Amino acid sequence: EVQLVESGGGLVQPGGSLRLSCAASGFTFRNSAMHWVRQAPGKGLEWVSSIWYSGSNTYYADSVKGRFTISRDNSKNTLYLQMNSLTAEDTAVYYCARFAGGWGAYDVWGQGTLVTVSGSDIQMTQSPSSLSASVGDRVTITCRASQSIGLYLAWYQQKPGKAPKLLIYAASSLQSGVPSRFSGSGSGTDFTLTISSLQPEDFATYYCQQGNTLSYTFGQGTKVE
Amino acid sequence: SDLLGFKIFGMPLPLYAFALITLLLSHFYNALPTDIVGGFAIMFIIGAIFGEIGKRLPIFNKYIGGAPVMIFLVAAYFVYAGIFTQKEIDAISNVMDKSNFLNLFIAVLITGAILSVNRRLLLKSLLGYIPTILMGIVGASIFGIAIGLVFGIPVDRIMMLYVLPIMGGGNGAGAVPLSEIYHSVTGRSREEYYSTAIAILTIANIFAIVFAAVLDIIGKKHTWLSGEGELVRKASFKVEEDEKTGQITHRETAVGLVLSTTCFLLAYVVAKKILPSIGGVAIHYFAWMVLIVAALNASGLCSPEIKAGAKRLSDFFSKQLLWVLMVGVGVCYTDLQEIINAITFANVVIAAIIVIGAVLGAAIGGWLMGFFPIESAITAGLCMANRGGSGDLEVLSACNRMNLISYAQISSRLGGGIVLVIASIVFGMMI
Amino acid sequence: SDLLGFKIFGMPLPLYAFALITLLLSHFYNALPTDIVGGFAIMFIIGAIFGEIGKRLPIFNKYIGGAPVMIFLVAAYFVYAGIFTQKEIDAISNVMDKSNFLNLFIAVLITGAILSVNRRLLLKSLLGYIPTILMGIVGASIFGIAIGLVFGIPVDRIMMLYVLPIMGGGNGAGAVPLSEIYHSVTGRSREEYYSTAIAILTIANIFAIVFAAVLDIIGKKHTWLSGEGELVRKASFKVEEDEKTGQITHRETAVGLVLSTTCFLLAYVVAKKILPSIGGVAIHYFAWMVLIVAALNASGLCSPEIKAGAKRLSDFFSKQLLWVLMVGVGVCYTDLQEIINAITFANVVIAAIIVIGAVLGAAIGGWLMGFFPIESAITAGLCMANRGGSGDLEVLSACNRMNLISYAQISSRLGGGIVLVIASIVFGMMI
Amino acid sequence: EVQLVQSGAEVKKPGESLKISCKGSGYSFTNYWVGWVRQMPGKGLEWMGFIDPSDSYTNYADSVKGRFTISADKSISTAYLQMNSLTASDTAMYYCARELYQGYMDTFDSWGQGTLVTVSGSDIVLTQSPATLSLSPGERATLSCRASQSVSSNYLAWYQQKPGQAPRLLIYDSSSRATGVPARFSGSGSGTDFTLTISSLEPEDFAVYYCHQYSDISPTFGQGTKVEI
Amino acid sequence: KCTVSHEVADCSHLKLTQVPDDLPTNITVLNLTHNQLRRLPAANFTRYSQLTSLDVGFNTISKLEPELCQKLPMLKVLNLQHNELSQLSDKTFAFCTNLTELHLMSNSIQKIKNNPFVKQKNLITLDLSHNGLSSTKLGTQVQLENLQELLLSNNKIQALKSEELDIFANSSLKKLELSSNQIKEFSPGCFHAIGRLFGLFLNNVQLGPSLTEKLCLELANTSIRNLSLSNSQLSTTSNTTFLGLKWTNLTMLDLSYNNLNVVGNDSFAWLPQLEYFFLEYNNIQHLFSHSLHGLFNVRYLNLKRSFTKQSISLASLPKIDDFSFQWLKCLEHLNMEDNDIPGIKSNMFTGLINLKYLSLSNSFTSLRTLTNETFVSLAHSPLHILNLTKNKISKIESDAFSWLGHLEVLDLGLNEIGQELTGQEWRGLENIFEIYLSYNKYLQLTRNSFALVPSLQRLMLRRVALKNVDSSPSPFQPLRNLTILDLSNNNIANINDDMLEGLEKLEILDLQHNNLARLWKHANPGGPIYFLKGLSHLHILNLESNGFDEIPVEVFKDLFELKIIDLGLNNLNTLPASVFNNQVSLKSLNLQKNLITSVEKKVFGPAFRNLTELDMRFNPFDCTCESIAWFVNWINETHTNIPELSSHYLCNTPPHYHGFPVRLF
Ligand SMILES: *[C@@H]1O[C@H](CO)[C@@H](O)[C@H](O)[C@H]1NC(C)=O
Ligand SMILES: *[C@@H]1O[C@H](CO)[C@@H](O)[C@H](O)[C@H]1NC(C)=O
Ligand SMILES: *[C@@H]1O[C@H](CO)[C@@H](O)[C@H](O)[C@H]1NC(C)=O
Ligand SMILES: *[C@@H]1O[C@H](CO)[C@@H](O)[C@H](O)[C@H]1NC(C)=O
């Protein structure tokens, strides 16, 4: 009585497509409904999908609905699972089992395979991650990039309850018409953002973006005040 | 008013309509217990409805085989058509893969068939009668392999799919056990085996009835060929001096079940532990059981009262419950495409040649054994290559010989296990 | 007699020794198929020898039904001592629980019983049946509260732990619902209640078996008290209406089984989907069996020969396969460890007093409306107190009366429903 | 003077299309490009693409690859964003912005007011009371499993899994047993309450045990208790 | 501490007062800078008598031993830096006549002996700095004809005297340095009691127009060729300020950072020839037409920051009269970087003849568009190089370069350029070779793009956001002489086959940071797109960071000359085998930060033949011997350079050697 997956596996970038296959050699594969079950590392079991014999009825779990596909071939005693638009959280070990109805629910299992989620951006990072500075203080926001950008850094500020609408630095050491008292500096891979003296209105989250390529990629969450 | 009085499975029509209503309702509401009771409930109705139509059909019944063939055909066609609910498939497969009801059925048939032979008759047949059957088999084998070489069919396929299934006792006992042995020894799929074998069997059944009276005509031409009416040439006379007690109690009939279950247990233990292999080849449990039952008959420990009881019980399984089993046989074994693919001119000439090969061997052997040649075939290779006991009354009816019924029964019943043993040996040796 | 002239289960000793040797070999070498075909062997072999033994013990043969009780006790003793291996325990569990052989047995007996009655006399007897058990519950309660006062045990605990749980239908129905209602209403633990009730019920079941055997001897002593298998007692209704039937062939006997299986599916579907509950009460599926079969008999759809065939089939199950079933009843549905752990003087005395008080009340009720006092106690007051269908089987087998199974099943299922209602009321009422 | 207005907030079913209108005023709108930015809840902000109103010339990011379409009409001076096939995990916040190309680096001078779109059980919920165990071989496990609502026909199961392997079945129905299991495990209970008791543990019997129900066509799993010494 | 034994002795930052005595003789250069030592031991130096050089820096030594240099006269150059000694005698210098250079740095010699350098006459260079003096008498007699450079920087010399400079009448000083010396007055005729003075430099000295006018008269009849002055506070100039210089013939001049404002007319009529001239960092408000009259022979001029910073509040508007350049008939190189001229007039450059280089980067505050005749003033000059970047141009009208035929290098990148290219703007262009247009906003392409100029050789287009780029007729079709082309960072999506055909001399291509992953996907409708054809001269190709995950095997068939190619930062995991067969000579490769897992010799059949360098520093390796067998073995047996082979080539994917160098295996 042997059931095995032995298919797919490896590291897949987000948006990747992977195919999983199952082989059973111990029983009459036809006339039996199959199930797919995955378990995330350190997590509990979870149902994925199931299919009747002849594939007349198909049902999916809610989470992966609309992006997953299941199929079988009785002539080859073989089961296929088709995965598209892979996402980050979809890392787990995937099992296939046989649902036997009243005379036992999940009798036989298979040795599942491990599939784990693993590019063309200018990686952008904000180091200080500062919080809760007193009024009138001096703050410093630094910058780090995967590839050297020449005087092509820009700054955006977001109010916590509103979209940013805040362009404070066109280029390095540049100021828009409205704001004042903000100082910026830096060149090459590193940059510095400073506010001369904190003010009661000067308490909001920040963001930074790159322009060396038309990709127009922004940075992760910056300092929140 | 044939609408009132026409009977289905010994039942008036309105009662059967009431019965079918329950099945329709259950299918509608999708509720069913998965156990023996749930199984029989849905097997009996389908079997009853689809068997009467098969039996009461002009050309089908007498030649193609009758109820079981078309019954399991319809079962396979439903399975292929995807009509059955998943619960129904589960409930049908449960009573044949987890309750293993098939094993009980087969054991009961084997023991009931063998144990009914008279002890004195069995001992007397041990002298020169059995070798006729054995050499008929071997003589058929050589022509079979020769003609298989003509079309380039490999030796192994001919020796495993054409000689054995033809030389059997029908699908009730002679085909299903062969498939089980084939799965046990090799390990490949079993659907292909039964599917491709059942066809050839039916094909041969027709030829059997064909030459049945053809030989009778040749005998009419010249008695020099063979004497008619007598099994042995210059046969002498003797006294049967038989003696049995007519009354059979319900308790006496039940004893038969106890003996059948016991023999199977002894066989499982000997093959698995006492002797893994007699020589370099392993022996299947079924083969051991046939020999064990024969030993009990030889000892004569059992009373004449007991021998009759097992005959009655084996007559209840083979006349009532066969329709119930045959549906599941169709469900879990048949592959429809193979049946269609199995029909070709080579497939109909191979069986024609092999039957002729069988007749030749038994005939010469009988003359060597002193028996009259004409009967030395009809009662040794013809009646032996049939659909078990059902078709044996037909070949004999084709000729004007009703006096050979005892020998025909001996042939069919006792050879029903010899072929099993030979098949196990061949499967072990060749593969 | 003779050293070789003795008979076992209708067989001579040397034949039996063969099967015994087979069993011993299988046990020692630890090789056994775990399915139906291997289940019958062990059951048959053990039951034969022991049921033969218990029919010959000097004092245990009269005051107690020897075989049907001692086999049941001996199987339990073996399973306690761990003498059995694992695989045959699995096989017996497979044949008794998974495949629901018990259900088939009960259905066949019910169908064989009912269909052999005159249609005109059916309902008239039924009208006064219920008040008998109604007042029997009261009679049981009187003695229960009396003994609780005697021991000073708080009476609320009396009804909540002893009176209601014992009178329930059984473990599957009549115990789990009691625990659920108990936990739902009083908000206390559910496991502990279920822990003690499951042992108290078996404790009283044993006494119920013993008391019934004693009653049969009393029936022999007094002709007037004995009903000799009669319920209404009036037994004066004209039975002139009679129809001669033809010899029941095997096909007719088989048809009974078909009906006994189809009716079960119909009842199961009805009780699971269509009419799950009448008013506020749940109805067990065997309950609808009796009503459906009675309606079928009333409609006059069946020829008189089908009824006769079903009678003979039920007769065959009643006298040959009974010793097999008892071994399984002991093995699967009886744990000696728990009754041993919870055994104590006070509980035993209380349980014994309760059962005898119930018996007295049931006999009184039967006498008042004119039933036979003894048969009014076996069917009502004993069958309701025992442990479900298995309990009814054992009780009726003790007194050698298979003809009253229908009334026992009615008192079981309907009684359990009524007890559920009474518990639902009183448990809230007092608490 | 410059302004941007977007469509209203919205909630619906996975598997749909939807259109969002970004309208602005205070300038020609025929000269400056318009792009879309998406911010996941409590996450960073990400770019998808932009379109030129002059000729509806477009450029999409690597993450889009269809599933999102950008369009506009000159007469209405409004931008349209549509996602064709919508599914789970697409719930987030959306905005539209206009480029100014201040200096030599492109800058998004104005941002749209904001649009929120969320794609959003009657299922049995399985909860187990004990979390972990640490006892010597001789004891009772009394593991438990509670359900959200009534489970019909007593459909339940229990599995165990030693580390680094597939699970194994122990109690397939609410009361019955598998083949190879010993005679110390025993299940009971019905309705919405169930138990699983062990007669006496052994050194081989320390692993994780789960709770499984299969009543409807929506299988649901409980959590796994831990058993140690 | 150790010395490189290469005829030198370097001993720096060792801060020891005792010189080593284990030094082999045959070395011949020494240094002891960044060290402290008490006095010179001649005995220790006596064992090794070979030293062409000796350096002591940051060493304070109160006196020197005279006997060491007579012991070792083959010493030719000597350094004394940061020494405590401030009064030395000729006794130490009595026998030291053989030195050719002596360094006196930060030694603070406030006064020297009367005649300490009578002994030596052969030295060429002597420098003095950080030394305070007010008298320049070093020898009463004429001597030292062989000295060419003398430095007096960081000195407090105040007044120069004629009697002081008679010492080198017999000598001819090549150049004197007097900067960083506050000097207030010069004695008349002091510069004449000496040989020919060729170069004089004066910076950061406050003179003013009047004092320069005085000193300008002092400079009559001199052999001066190079005058330098900056930060001299000359806000304006007069004609008499440069009058006395009429009696000499200068060659070079510089007026940088003097913050000059206004020049009168004909202030430069005295110089017919000035080949090089620098004017930068001055606040000039207006230029006069005849201000620069008389300068015929000029070749190089600059005006960076040499004008008024524009302020509309001031409304200064530094304006230039046209035809002001009609006097410059020889200019070849001009520099107009980063100024604020309002706009281009019509006759700035009427008369220019020899111009070959001209820069106008960030030179105009407002040049929005190019017109028909905006360059009409440049009709009569064969310019070769033009610079027009950082000029915030907006749009170009066609037929603007009609005058320019001789131009060969054009630079227009880094501006604000968005339009559609009609191709008619390239009318007059004839000899152009290279054009830069990267860092612009957008362009719309037509097939009528480069028909006028198939003579081009290089074209840079980076981050420009092109439109109409996937047109089936290649807009590059008329061009066939292209050598290198770049299209990086444009993030283009769809590509036709037809752009790469008919071109044969393309040397290098660059397409990184673009989105072309779909076009080589196997499931691509129409299959993979094979645009690589007709290229027999490509040597270097770059395809970094483009999202690639699959390579068809038939793309390198035409590539026989490829030498270096990069595919790092992509999404590649596994490649098909037998694909580098046509690659006869590959010298380098880069696949770091990909998702390559296994190394298998079948794919690296022709790859691992002969390489110079390969890099895959970060990849999810399965460091198990099924695949790593060759790679582990090959590393231990191969000479090809693999940087950070152990530093950044570990394996964490498999438990085997988890987080451990694959080489160790
Ligand atoms: C300088 O020293 C070298 C080596 O001792 C000697 O040959 C040469 O004549 C010296 N020159 C003078 C002018 O003393
Ligand atoms: C330049 O200086 C004087 C005065 O202009 C002139 O007479 C002389 O010939 C020139 N000297 C040279 C080296 O051309
Ligand atoms: C601009 O140049 C074109 C082409 O030489 C000419 O036809 C037109 O008259 C010019 N316009 C002006 C205002 O000079
Ligand atoms: C330009 O290319 C064409 C076509 O290959 C060629 O005939 C012509 O000689 C080339 N011109 C130069 C100057 O290389």
Which residues of chain C have a CB within 8 Å of the CB of D193? 180, 183, 190
The closest alpha carbon to B202, from B317, B343, B399, B358, belongs to B343
Ligand 3 close to Cβ of residue E416 (< 6 A): no
Task: Please state the domain count of chain C.
Answer: 2
Which of E440, E545, E622 is the best residue to mutate to test the A interface, defined by the most A CB atoms within 10 Å of its own CB? E545
* Secondary structure of residue D12 in the 3-state scheme: strand
E637 occurs within a structural domain: no
C166 occurs within a structural domain: yes
Taking the C-alpha atoms of residue E464 and residue E462, their distance in angstroms, rounded to an integer, is 6
Residue in E465, E547, E653 closest to A120 by CB: E547
Judgement on whether residues C296 and C372 belong to the same structural domain of the protein: yes
Judgement on whether residues B254 and B126 belong to the same structural domain of the protein: yes
* Secondary structure of residue C423 in the 3-state scheme: helix
E130-152: b or e for each residue (b if 16 or more CB lie within 10 Å)?
Answer: bbebeebebeeeebbeebeebbb
Do A35 and A50 touch, CB atoms closer than 8 A?
A: yes
Judgement on whether residues D138 and D103 belong to the same structural domain of the protein: no
Strands D10-12 and D115-119, how do they pair?
Answer: parallel
Taking the C-alpha atoms of residue B329 and residue B321, their distance in angstroms, rounded to an integer, is 13
Please count the residues of chain C.
431
* Secondary structure of residue D127 in the 3-state scheme: strand
The closest alpha carbon to A224, from A126, A136, A130, A143, belongs to A130
H/E element, E252: strand E252-254
Residue B96 in contact with partner chain A when CB distance is under 8 A: no
Judgement on whether residues B207 and B350 belong to the same structural domain of the protein: yes
- Inter-chain CB proximity B93 and A101 less than 8 Å: no
- Which residues, other chains included, contact D203 with Cβ-Cβ below 8 Å and sequence gap of 6+? D137
Taking the C-alpha atoms of residue B358 and residue E626, their distance in angstroms, rounded to an integer, is 60
The number of the ligand 2 atom at minimal distance from the alpha carbon of E222 is 2
Residue in D63, D111, D168 closest to A164 by CB: D111
- Which residues, other chains included, contact C306 with Cβ-Cβ below 8 Å and sequence gap of 6+? C115, C252, C255, C256, C259
Enumerate residues lining ligand 1, CB below 6 A.
E 73-74, 98, 122
Which residues of chain D have a CB within 8 Å of the CB of A220? 44
Which residues of chain E have a CB within 8 Å of the CB of D104? 414, 416, 439
Judgement on whether residues B352 and B416 belong to the same structural domain of the protein: yes
Strands E53-57 and E29-31, how do they pair?
Answer: parallel
For residue A47, what are the β-bridge partners? Answer: A37
Taking the C-alpha atoms of residue B313 and residue B109, their distance in angstroms, rounded to an integer, is 9
Judgement on whether residues B282 and B339 belong to the same structural domain of the protein: yes
Do E273 and E244 touch, CB atoms closer than 8 A?
A: no
Do B121 and B241 touch, CB atoms closer than 8 A?
A: no
E20 occurs within a structural domain: no
B298 occurs within a structural domain: yes
Which residues of chain D have a CB within 8 Å of the CB of C190? 189, 193
Q: Report the amino acid identity of residue C194.
A: Y
Do C412 and C388 touch, CB atoms closer than 8 A?
A: yes
Residue in A52, A53, A103 closest to B94 by CB: A103
How far, in Å, is the centroid of ligand 1 from the Cα of E74? 5
> Quick one: tokens of A103?
């005379």
Taking the C-alpha atoms of residue E627 and residue E646, their distance in angstroms, rounded to an integer, is 18
Helices (H), A18-173: none
The closest alpha carbon to C208, from C156, C170, C152, belongs to C170
Judgement on whether residues C95 and C30 belong to the same structural domain of the protein: yes
Q: Report the amino acid identity of residue D26.
A: G
3-state per-residue secondary structure call for E464-512: CCEECCCCCCCCCCCCCCCCEEECCCCCCCCCCHHHCCCCCCCCEEECC
First to last CA, chain D: 73
The closest alpha carbon to E563, from E575, E550, E547, E580, belongs to E580
Taking the C-alpha atoms of residue E597 and residue E613, their distance in angstroms, rounded to an integer, is 19
Closest-CA residue of chain D to C88? D179
Q: In which domain, by residue range, is E562 found?
A: 483-597
Give burial (CB, 10 Å; 0-12/13-18/19+) of D134: exposed
- Inter-chain CB proximity D182 and C190 less than 8 Å: no
CA E565 → CA D93, E247, E541, distances in Å?
Answer: 42, 65, 5
Judgement on whether residues D112 and D138 belong to the same structural domain of the protein: no
For residue E77, what are the β-bridge partners? Answer: E53, E101
* Secondary structure of residue C278 in the 3-state scheme: strand
Judgement on whether residues D115 and D149 belong to the same structural domain of the protein: no
How far, in Å, is the centroid of ligand 1 from the Cα of B280? 111
How far, in Å, is the centroid of ligand 3 from the Cα of E371? 9
Do C3 and B289 touch, CB atoms closer than 8 A?
A: no
Taking the C-alpha atoms of residue A191 and residue A182, their distance in angstroms, rounded to an integer, is 14
- Inter-chain CB proximity D62 and E515 less than 8 Å: yes
How far, in Å, is the centroid of ligand 4 from the Cα of C8? 117
Do B418 and B133 touch, CB atoms closer than 8 A?
A: yes
> Quick one: tokens of D218?
């929506």
B28 occurs within a structural domain: yes
Judgement on whether residues D222 and D143 belong to the same structural domain of the protein: yes
**Hey, what domains does chain A have and what are their CATH numbers?**
3-117 (2.60.40.10), 124-210 (2.60.40.10)
Taking the C-alpha atoms of residue C410 and residue C231, their distance in angstroms, rounded to an integer, is 14
E198 occurs within a structural domain: no
The residue whose CA has the least distance to atom 8 of ligand 3 is E372
* Secondary structure of residue B374 in the 3-state scheme: helix
Taking the C-alpha atoms of residue B28 and residue B75, their distance in angstroms, rounded to an integer, is 19
Domain stops at, among D119, D141, D167: D119
Q: CA angle E21-E25-E29, nearest 5°?
A: 90
How far, in Å, is the centroid of ligand 3 from the Cα of E372? 6
Ligand 4 close to Cβ of residue E226 (< 6 A): no
Q: How far is B31 from chain C (nearest CA, A)?
A: 6
Taking the C-alpha atoms of residue A27 and residue A35, their distance in angstroms, rounded to an integer, is 16
Please count the residues of chain A.
225
Q: CA angle B375-B381-B384, nearest 5°?
A: 110
Judgement on whether residues D88 and D159 belong to the same structural domain of the protein: no
**Does the annotation flag B118 for ligand binding?**
no
Phi (first) and psi of residue C70, to 5 degrees: -70, -35
Judgement on whether residues B257 and B343 belong to the same structural domain of the protein: yes
Cα E120 → chain centroid: 41
Q: CA angle B363-B368-B372, nearest 5°?
A: 55
Judgement on whether residues B394 and B358 belong to the same structural domain of the protein: yes
- Inter-chain CB proximity A221 and D44 less than 8 Å: yes
- Inter-chain CB proximity B332 and A52 less than 8 Å: no
Ligand 3 close to Cβ of residue E372 (< 6 A): yes
C256 occurs within a structural domain: no
B241 occurs within a structural domain: no
The closest alpha carbon to B379, from B232, B215, B231, B238, belongs to B231
C81-112: b or e for each residue (b if 16 or more CB lie within 10 Å)?
Answer: eeebebbbbbbbbbbbbbbbbbbbbbbbbbbb
- Which residues, other chains included, contact B24 with Cβ-Cβ below 8 Å and sequence gap of 6+? none
Do B32 and B45 touch, CB atoms closer than 8 A?
A: no
Judgement on whether residues D66 and D141 belong to the same structural domain of the protein: no
- Inter-chain CB proximity E416 and D59 less than 8 Å: no
Judgement on whether residues B26 and B121 belong to the same structural domain of the protein: no
Exposure on the CB side of residue B349, measured as CA atoms within 13 A: 9
Q: Report the amino acid identity of residue E306.
A: S
CA E564 → CA E505, E508, E575, distances in Å?
Answer: 17, 10, 18
**Does the annotation flag B205 for ligand binding?**
no
- Inter-chain CB proximity A44 and D159 less than 8 Å: no
Taking the C-alpha atoms of residue C373 and residue C375, their distance in angstroms, rounded to an integer, is 6
Cα A88 → chain centroid: 4
Specify the CATH number for the domain of residue E550.
3.80.10.10
Do D159 and D212 touch, CB atoms closer than 8 A?
A: yes
Judgement on whether residues B111 and B84 belong to the same structural domain of the protein: no
C266 occurs within a structural domain: no
For residue E444, what are the β-bridge partners? Answer: E420, E467
Q: Which residue has the tokens 């010339």?
A: D57
Q: Report the amino acid identity of residue C429.
A: M
Q: In which domain, by residue range, is C163 found?
A: 124-232+288-302+334-430
> Quick one: tokens of C346?
């006070």
Judgement on whether residues D188 and D105 belong to the same structural domain of the protein: no
Phi (first) and psi of residue C274, to 5 degrees: -80, -60
Question: Is the Cα torsion angle E580, E583, E589, E590 positive or negative in sign?
Answer: negative
E360 occurs within a structural domain: no
How far, in Å, is the centroid of ligand 3 from the Cα of E344? 17
Neighbours of E403 (CB within 10 A): 17
Taking the C-alpha atoms of residue E112 and residue E86, their distance in angstroms, rounded to an integer, is 7
Residue D150 in contact with partner chain C when CB distance is under 8 A: no
How far, in Å, is the centroid of ligand 4 from the Cα of E481? 5
- Which residues, other chains included, contact E575 with Cβ-Cβ below 8 Å and sequence gap of 6+? E551, E603
DSSP letters, B302-366, are S-HHHHHHHHHHHHHIIIIIHHHHHHHHHHHH--HHHHHHT-SHHHHHHHHHHHHHHHHHHHHHH
B92 occurs within a structural domain: yes
Q: Report the amino acid identity of residue D37.
A: V
- The DSSP code for B381 is I
DSSP letters, A165-211, are --EEESSTT---SS--SEEEEEETTEEEEEESS--SS---EEEEEE-
Phi (first) and psi of residue D81, to 5 degrees: -125, 125
Judgement on whether residues C292 and C398 belong to the same structural domain of the protein: yes
Taking the C-alpha atoms of residue E149 and residue E125, their distance in angstroms, rounded to an integer, is 5
Taking the C-alpha atoms of residue A168 and residue A141, their distance in angstroms, rounded to an integer, is 14
B240-278: b or e for each residue (b if 16 or more CB lie within 10 Å)?
Answer: eeeeeeeeeeeebbbbbbbbbbbbbbbbbbbbeeeeeee
Taking the C-alpha atoms of residue D78 and residue D29, their distance in angstroms, rounded to an integer, is 9
The residue whose CA has the least distance to atom 3 of ligand 1 is E74
The closest alpha carbon to C207, from C352, C377, C350, C109, belongs to C352
Instruction: Tell me whether chains B and A touch (3+ CB pairs under 8 A).
Output: yes
Judgement on whether residues D132 and D203 belong to the same structural domain of the protein: yes
Taking the C-alpha atoms of residue E529 and residue E550, their distance in angstroms, rounded to an integer, is 12
Which of C9, C16, C22 is the best residue to mutate to test the B interface, defined by the most B CB atoms within 10 Å of its own CB? C22
Cα E362 → chain centroid: 20
Give burial (CB, 10 Å; 0-12/13-18/19+) of C428: exposed
Taking the C-alpha atoms of residue D19 and residue D17, their distance in angstroms, rounded to an integer, is 7
Q: In which domain, by residue range, is D169 found?
A: 126-228
Phi (first) and psi of residue E543, to 5 degrees: -140, 45
Chains touching B (at least 3 CB pairs under 8 A) are A, C
E524-535: b or e for each residue (b if 16 or more CB lie within 10 Å)?
Answer: eeeebbebbeeb
Taking the C-alpha atoms of residue C1 and residue C101, their distance in angstroms, rounded to an integer, is 39
Taking the C-alpha atoms of residue B235 and residue B224, their distance in angstroms, rounded to an integer, is 16
Longest Cα–Cα distance in chain B: 72
Strands D57-60 and D45-52, how do they pair?
Answer: antiparallel
Ligand 4 close to Cβ of residue E481 (< 6 A): yes
Phi (first) and psi of residue B366, to 5 degrees: -65, -45
> Quick one: tokens of D128?
């187990």
How far, in Å, is the centroid of ligand 4 from the Cα of E224? 53
The number of the ligand 1 atom at minimal distance from the alpha carbon of E73 is 2
Taking the C-alpha atoms of residue B319 and residue C106, their distance in angstroms, rounded to an integer, is 25
Residue in A10, A13, A212 closest to E571 by CB: A13
Q: Report the amino acid identity of residue E213.
A: E
Taking the C-alpha atoms of residue E52 and residue D35, their distance in angstroms, rounded to an integer, is 72
> Quick one: tokens of A150?
């020449």
**Does the annotation flag B46 for ligand binding?**
no
Chains touching A (at least 3 CB pairs under 8 A) are B, D, E
Instruction: Tell me whether chains E and C touch (3+ CB pairs under 8 A).
Output: no
Q: How far is A40 from chain B (nearest CA, A)?
A: 30
Give burial (CB, 10 Å; 0-12/13-18/19+) of A188: exposed
Phi (first) and psi of residue C77, to 5 degrees: -65, -40
Cβ contacts below 8 Å, chain A against chain D, sum to 107
Do E608 and E586 touch, CB atoms closer than 8 A?
A: no
> Quick one: tokens of B232?
């042995």
Taking the C-alpha atoms of residue A194 and residue A202, their distance in angstroms, rounded to an integer, is 12
Neighbours of D154 (CB within 10 A): 16
Residue in A53, A102, A103 closest to B89 by CB: A53
Phi (first) and psi of residue E592, to 5 degrees: -65, 150
E559 occurs within a structural domain: yes
Q: Which resolution, in Å, applies to this structure?
A: 3.8
Experimental method: cryo-EM
Phi (first) and psi of residue B81, to 5 degrees: -80, -10
H/E element, E588: strand E588-590
Q: Report the amino acid identity of residue A187.
A: S
Do E595 and E567 touch, CB atoms closer than 8 A?
A: no
Do A221 and A131 touch, CB atoms closer than 8 A?
A: no
Judgement on whether residues C148 and C93 belong to the same structural domain of the protein: no
> Considering only residues 161 to 200 of chain D, which have any Cβ-Cβ distance to chain C shorter than 8 Å?
176-177, 179, 182-183, 188-191, 193, 195
E414 occurs within a structural domain: no
For residue E358, what are the β-bridge partners? Answer: E334, E386
C40 occurs within a structural domain: yes
Strands (E), chain A: 3-4, 10-12, 18-24, 33-39, 45-51, 58-60, 68-73, 78-83, 92-99, 113-117, 124-125, 139-145, 153-158, 167-169, 182-187, 190-195, 205-210
Taking the C-alpha atoms of residue C371 and residue C230, their distance in angstroms, rounded to an integer, is 8
Instruction: Tell me whether chains B and E touch (3+ CB pairs under 8 A).
Output: no
Quote the radius of gyration of chain E (alpha carbons, Å): 35
DSSP letters, E266-323, are TTTTT-SB-SEEE--S----EE-GGGGTT--B--EEE-TT-SPPP-TTTT---EE-TT
Domain stops at, among B82, B99, B116: B99
H/E element, C308: helix C304-319
The closest alpha carbon to E78, from B139, D175, E92, belongs to E92
The closest alpha carbon to E509, from E542, E461, E460, belongs to E542
Task: Please state the domain count of chain D.
Answer: 2
Give burial (CB, 10 Å; 0-12/13-18/19+) of A169: buried
The residue whose CA has the least distance to atom 4 of ligand 3 is E372
E497 occurs within a structural domain: yes
CA E466 → CA B55, B62, B78, D42, distances in Å?
Answer: 83, 86, 64, 35
